[PDB]
């Protein structure tokens, strides 16, 4: 419900600002707190109370609250802050706690690069062990964040998707995968079937069919 | 200093209970909230309950209400976390939280991974990821083979035994929703070559002792 952009990049010594946008019974209310996660670590807190630093955070860290929308600035980027980052605050209607979606931020080491996407039909053998598994790999982007999306003809389908978290390649870009898993019955009963990649405002969308190679 | 150690995680069957604890060390446990946290693969974080420094107050995120109880014993300094009816999105590390004064976070475990799986050790099938059809001499094809629902992990994946090394690239796996993990490796290869040179992919899944080699070639297109 509390939602923030997927990613937010800018180069070394820069600055970014992250957003996080709520409603009058959670961010309009409420405090709002922000944190630093890389995961396999432990969340660290930058800022409580909308804009007050804990001991330890530098000034670099600042956050601001408008209305119902929150804000974290980070000025003077280093690599040491690529991780992402929540907003967190309570919601007096749910009596629960909220985290915004998360933003990962990139500090920029390398040349930005979309995505090449390549979208693998169900082989000839899955189908004949009757399942059906499309493939979309998608390769050499960076800054390392995608949305994917997938499409049956020309309607969102959620079910049956997985998708990995972008890692690097050998070449030092990203690659990431994503799998709808559907049933041979499913997989032939529509005319076609996409992977939709969203990286930095940009869409690449790859399109397969059953009655085409 | 302040600690926080979480255990109780593991591998557990879907429908079944599991129960995590939370030791804290280096304050006066009586005196503060503890929250429950969660990161299920790939997800954000997902905030799952808090109880209050006595236990009169206890909160749950809609996700878990009915099925996860909160509780603390306050002298064994233990957080406790009971969770029932357990299902393949609860799969997750779960991190115990200090709560400060009802307005933020300040000190975290280091977690406890917890598995929703009714699998048991089971080697993969390997299927090819063929080239397309639309493949030219004078241009390059991405080719693979997809390492389907093996458990537990890991899967390693090699290509021509080892000969062919440059432009691959193996994906992390996914855990599928039935409880069984799927990866995928990739290779881009000259579209020359695929009239002539044979591509195999080979999967080694140790905890079965099973090894499969798939020859992945071009479709009847
Ligand atoms: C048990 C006492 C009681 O009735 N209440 C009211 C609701 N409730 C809260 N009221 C205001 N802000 C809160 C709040 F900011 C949080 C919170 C926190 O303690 C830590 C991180 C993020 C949060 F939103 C939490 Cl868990 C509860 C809050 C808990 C305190
Ligand atoms: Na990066
Ligand atoms: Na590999």
């Known amino acids: 419900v509390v939602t923030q952009p997927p990613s937010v990049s800018a180069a070394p010594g820069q600055e970014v600002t992250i957003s996080c946008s709520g409603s009058?019974?959670?961010?309009?209310?409420?405090?709002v707190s922000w944190y630093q996660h890389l995961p396999g670590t432990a969340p660290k807190l930058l800022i409580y109370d909308s804009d007050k630093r804990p001991s330890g955070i530098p000034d670099r860290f600042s956050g601001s609250k408008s209305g119902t929308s929150a804000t974290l600035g980070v000025t003077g980027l280093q690599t040491g802050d690529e991780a992402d980052y929540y907003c967190?605050?309570?919601?007096?209607?749910?009596?629960?706690?909220?985290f915004g979606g998360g933003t990962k931020l990139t500090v920029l080491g390398q040349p930005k690069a979309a995505p090449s996407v390549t979208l693998f039909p169900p082989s000839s053998e899955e189908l004949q062990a009757n399942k059906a598994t499309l493939v979309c790999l998608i390769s050499d982007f960076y800054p390392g964040a995608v949305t994917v999306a997938w499409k049956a003809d020309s309607s969102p389908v959620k079910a049956g998707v997985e998708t990995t978290t972008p890692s690097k390649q050998s070449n030092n870009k990203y690659a990431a995968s994503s799998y709808l898993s559907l049933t041979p019955e499913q997989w032939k009963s529509h005319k076609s079937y996409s992977c939709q990649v969203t990286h930095e405002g940009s869409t690449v969308e790859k399109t397969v069919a059953p009655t085409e190679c | 200093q302040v600690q926080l150690q979480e255990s109780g995680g593991g591998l557990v069957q879907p429908g079944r209970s599991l129960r995590l604890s939370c030791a804290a060390s280096?304050?006066?446990?009586?005196?503060?909230?503890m929250h429950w946290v969660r990161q299920a693969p790939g997800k954000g974080l997902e905030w799952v309950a808090v109880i209050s420094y006595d236990g009169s107050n206890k909160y749950y995120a809609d996700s878990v209400k009915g099925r996860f109880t909160i509780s603390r014993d306050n002298s064994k300094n233990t957080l406790y976390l009971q969770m029932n009816s357990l299902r393949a999105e609860d799969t997750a590390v779960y991190y115990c939280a200090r709560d400060y004064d009802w307005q933020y976070f300040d000190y975290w475990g280091q977690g406890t991974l917890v598995t929703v799986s009714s699998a048991s050790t089971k080697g993969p099938s390997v299927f090819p990821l063929a080239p397309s059809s639309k493949s030219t001499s004078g241009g390059t094809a991405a080719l693979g083979c997809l390492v389907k629902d093996y458990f537990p992990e890991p899967v390693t994946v090699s290509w021509n035994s080892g000969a062919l090394t440059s432009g691959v690239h193996t994906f992390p796996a996914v855990l599928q929703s039935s409880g069984l993990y799927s990866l995928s490796s990739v290779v881009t290869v000259p579209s020359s070559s695929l009239g002539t040179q044979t591509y195999i992919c080979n999967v080694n899944h140790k905890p079965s002792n099973t090894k499969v080699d798939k020859k992945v070639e071009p479709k009847s297109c």
């Open positions: 009058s019974s959670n961010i309009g209310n409420n405090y």
């Open positions: 967190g605050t309570w919601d007096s209607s749910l009596s629960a706690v909220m």
């Open positions: 280096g304050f006066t446990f009586s005196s503060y909230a």
